[PDB]
């Protein structure tokens, strides 16, 4: 159970971290694929790549 | 005549133009307007 009480901490750790990769991706999106896909709205693609 | 059909093409042509969702900045200002509307009311 140690190990599994510790892997809850990996999930909000890593939870954590990937907040680098969003925002280069975010400005990937803004500098580019939204303002390519003529104006929305949110873009799915972008939120699946990051995912 | 001649100028009520300037008058009758150029009615079209803004119409025509209107078919594209083209965004911008003053957006914003009425999607504040959903939150006032649909979230705060």
Known sequence: REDFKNWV???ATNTQ???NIIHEEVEK???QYRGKELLGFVNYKTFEIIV | VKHTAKAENM???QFRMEQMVFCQDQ???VVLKKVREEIFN
């Open chain 1, 9 to 11: 901490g990996i999930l």
């Open chain 1, 17 to 19: 971290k990937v907040k």
């Open chain 1, 29 to 31: 999106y803004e500098k």
């Open chain 2, 11 to 13: 009615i079209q042509l």
């Open chain 2, 27 to 29: 957006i914003y200002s």
